[model samples]
Target: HHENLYFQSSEKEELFEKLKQTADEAVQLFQRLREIFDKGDDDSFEQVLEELEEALQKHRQLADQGRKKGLLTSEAAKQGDQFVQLFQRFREAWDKGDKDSLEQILEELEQVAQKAVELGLKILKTQ
Candidate 1:
């Protein structure tokens, strides 16, 4: 009765759930980074940034898989690339102790990451 056939629906849900898990993890890292930033703990900040990078790595991998499966468009994957690149800029600002830049970059990174997740979910009409 419907012509929306494409990828396997069950597989899509699995990816969607895992993607959401990664997004949630990133959000928690952002919150922890805020705490560390406010505390002005350089060591802790760097440590947390490492973990954030790991999380972002997982995020990027999942996105690539999504793209290969046609679960996401190139546009969505490009946005995800920007999300991770934005993190590099945030780390650079932190290196210079540029508080203002760090603040702005982190805010923007969070928004961009959220958008990436939303974009990846574009095929969820079946759900």
Candidate 2:
């Protein structure tokens, strides 16, 4: 979800709106997940996982929309995959309560965000 927002250059207001909407959805999803975790029930946690998967599906749709809009390029798509892998790394660490994993993910995210911003600037310049 963060990668989707990051890759969407500032070339259009629509992109920002879409990113913002997705971010909001992500927050809602996370909030729900938090509730499930707090509940401490196994079956309910599985249900929450299912909902999380659906939310992620919706997030993918938003990214696909942006790709169709030409806001994302092939290279951007490749980098996006790497960004997701980085996210998974953090997620795994988070599941185990590892702080170092969080730092590593943040560092990787910063690099990805910078690349996205650079691409966005170039895109805007061309316009």
Candidate 3:
């Protein structure tokens, strides 16, 4: 019983660390994209979008693993679900020929990323 309890606790601890790392990576990626936007250079939007997509892909992969492991709380799962919706919105904006849509999508994506980070931090603190 004691060993089982220890295992359960350690598993939770591991999940917490994994979630924190995912959040940190996500926030850093968003900060990078935000900097690109802030520069307003008008030249790096495509490049930045590419980077942002790649970063999001990485985070999504991590989240998939987390889901598979049953490591995510309901709150984290909700955020993960929101990320899919956000990605769909971006794809729709791209398909609709909206020139300004990418910027709007990026802003929304950044907010989601920050929200994930915040949620992860809250989970860590609570656990």
TM-score of 2: 0.45
The TM-score measured for candidate 3 stands at: 0.62
The TM-score of candidate 1 is 0.73
Tens digit of lDDT per residue, candidate 2, span 3-122? 543454555566556555664565565556557656666577557656655665565566577666655454545665775677567567656867676656756755774575465345
The candidate, 1 or 3, that scores higher on TM-score is 1
Query: Residue by residue across 56-126, what tens digits does model 3's lDDT show?
Result: 67666655654565444457668867976886687577667674986788778768866776775676564
lDDT of 1 at 105: 89
Q: Candidate 1 on 86-118: residue-level lDDT in tens?
A: 989998998898989999987797688678767
Which pairs, if any, clash in model 2? none
- What alpha-carbon RMSD in Å does predicted model 2 have with respect to the real structure? 8.7
* Candidate 3 positional error at 50, Å: 2.9
lDDT agreement with native, every candidate: 0.75, 0.58, 0.64
